[PDB]
Design an enzyme around this catalytic site. Sequence first.
Site, PDB file in Angstrom:
ATOM      1  N   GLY A   4      33.311  39.958  38.725  1.00 50.07           N
ATOM      2  CA  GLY A   4      33.788  40.521  39.982  1.00 50.07           C
ATOM      3  C   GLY A   4      32.688  41.226  40.782  1.00 50.07           C
ATOM      4  O   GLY A   4      32.646  41.123  41.999  1.00 50.07           O
ATOM      5  N   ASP A  50      25.543  43.057  32.563  1.00 52.54           N
ATOM      6  CA  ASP A  50      26.912  42.823  32.066  1.00 52.54           C
ATOM      7  C   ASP A  50      27.015  41.500  31.285  1.00 52.54           C
ATOM      8  O   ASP A  50      27.168  40.425  31.869  1.00 52.54           O
ATOM      9  CB  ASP A  50      27.902  42.874  33.205  1.00 52.54           C
ATOM     10  CG  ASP A  50      29.340  42.762  32.752  1.00 52.54           C
ATOM     11  OD1 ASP A  50      29.619  42.579  31.545  1.00 52.54           O
ATOM     12  OD2 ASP A  50      30.273  42.820  33.574  1.00 52.54           O
ATOM     13  N   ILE A  70      34.775  32.939  33.953  1.00 52.82           N
ATOM     14  CA  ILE A  70      34.864  33.417  35.337  1.00 52.82           C
ATOM     15  C   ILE A  70      33.590  34.127  35.758  1.00 52.82           C
ATOM     16  O   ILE A  70      32.811  34.619  34.929  1.00 52.82           O
ATOM     17  CB  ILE A  70      36.080  34.368  35.593  1.00 52.82           C
ATOM     18  CG1 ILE A  70      35.932  35.693  34.842  1.00 52.82           C
ATOM     19  CG2 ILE A  70      37.386  33.661  35.232  1.00 52.82           C
ATOM     20  CD1 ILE A  70      37.162  36.645  35.004  1.00 52.82           C
ATOM     21  N   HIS A 120      32.366  35.784  31.040  1.00 54.46           N
ATOM     22  CA  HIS A 120      31.588  35.213  32.146  1.00 54.46           C
ATOM     23  C   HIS A 120      30.661  34.059  31.737  1.00 54.46           C
ATOM     24  O   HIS A 120      29.930  33.516  32.570  1.00 54.46           O
ATOM     25  CB  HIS A 120      30.801  36.305  32.878  1.00 54.46           C
ATOM     26  CG  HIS A 120      31.644  37.476  33.265  1.00 54.46           C
ATOM     27  ND1 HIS A 120      32.848  37.338  33.929  1.00 54.46           N
ATOM     28  CD2 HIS A 120      31.485  38.803  33.046  1.00 54.46           C
ATOM     29  CE1 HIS A 120      33.397  38.533  34.089  1.00 54.46           C
ATOM     30  NE2 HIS A 120      32.595  39.436  33.551  1.00 54.46           N
TER      31      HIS A 120
END
Lengths: 270, 272
Positions: free
Chosen positions: A201, A178, A198, A183
């Site tokens: 998840g 990903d 971030i 990110h």
Amino acid sequence: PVWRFDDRDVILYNIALGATTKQLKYVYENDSDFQVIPTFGHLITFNSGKSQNSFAKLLRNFNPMLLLHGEHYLKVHSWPPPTEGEIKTTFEPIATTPKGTNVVIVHGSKSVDNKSGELIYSNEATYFIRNCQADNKVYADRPAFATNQFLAPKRAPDYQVDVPVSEDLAALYRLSGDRNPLHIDPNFAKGAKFPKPILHGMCTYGLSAKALIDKFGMFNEIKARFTGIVFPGETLRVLAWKESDDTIVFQTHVVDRGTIAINNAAIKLV
Amino acid sequence: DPVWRFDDRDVILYNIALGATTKQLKYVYENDSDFQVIPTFGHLITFNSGKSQNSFAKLLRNFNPMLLLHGEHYLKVHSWPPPTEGEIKTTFEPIATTPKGTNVVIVHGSKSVDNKSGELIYSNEATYFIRNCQADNKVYADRPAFATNQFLAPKRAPDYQVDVPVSEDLAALYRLSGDRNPLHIDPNFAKGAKFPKPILHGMCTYGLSAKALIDKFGMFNEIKARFTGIVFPGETLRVLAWKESDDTIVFQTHVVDRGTIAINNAAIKLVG
């Protein structure tokens, strides 16, 4: 849609979820118990090159920037899961539910052994999409574990563990597939009204999964809801309750901001 | 001749293993405008194929792969900057061989070209030291001056020094770049090779050193070093550097924890 993977994928992923050199079973291909952390099965998302987006045909006015990954459910059907090989993934919508100006879509997948047809993993992802229209339809029934709200009982957690998240963990974790710039790229992230990039998840989810295995042993089913962001460099706190002989209910808290990243979640032990 | 296919993923994994962080997106993010690879990356053809290890075990007698030690390494980058993706084709040619008691000292060369053009990208000269082995006494080709230069540390105090922690887990990550030798991760094989516990790859120490040097002095296109001491995961390195011309940075790498020298007789040639 065929994905060929090997011990390098397995170890890169395991290390990103906190596997250490003390745990040779995770980081060393010749260990007698060499094994993959079972959340690895979701990665077909990034190695099923176009097919993954098959739910989109059911949507209208679909804007990808307005999509949110709200829940994930994973099952391992062949124990233990393989650490190398070739898998074929079939994608199929499970449900579409119009909600005001938005849609909630449940998108399912099944990954089988490409040279025997043996079912290895299944995934069910729930997506929440703003300013999107769809038909009100149900294509398949769902496992109880997938829709269970797994409310934390009103007693003390049986277990608590803190998991520091390296400031650079997203940089390593994204090598598992990903590449989303949210990110990693501060310009993109801040451009998107985030304070800085971030953590994935699914990395929070995996980190949680790994921590729970260290304490409770392996699991073949996992379900969770994403309720909050995590930043690299922060510390996660996993709270866990042993709720049956089968079932570990958990939450993942973010210590630094006093929020909750993972809720309505559990694993089923092998 | 082995064909090596690599991409941004290999580059970032390599760079991260050498201590690159998100403070330096040019090393860890493929869409960075300055995205690049630490140039020791070009050595990886040394360990990542079967014709890289069987192609010299060819003058070898009683060879045990687990009794192998890496003694010196020379690398030149001929095509600047080194590519962050592509296909490379490598040719291996023996440079020299020598018995020293019951063990064997071998100098093995390689040249790495682009598979689409035939353009020279990397040159490598490895020097191996193998225990409990036996070989002919031979010499097959000449060597660049930079490869055999002893680069003695000047007597003055260093112009620059920096410490580099080595994670207890670093060999587990680093070995994913291609060198799977169990000596660096399995206690059983480490002890089989007469070490008390697994040792860090010499090339990781080499690369950690290179990375620290780049941060201070800029990019290099030529590097040479002698391996003189083990490093264990968990220890702290100390790079000592001496600016020895506008071109050349001489260095040593010490192990702070045990007061030893892991890398000596070493230098880099800065790019223009």
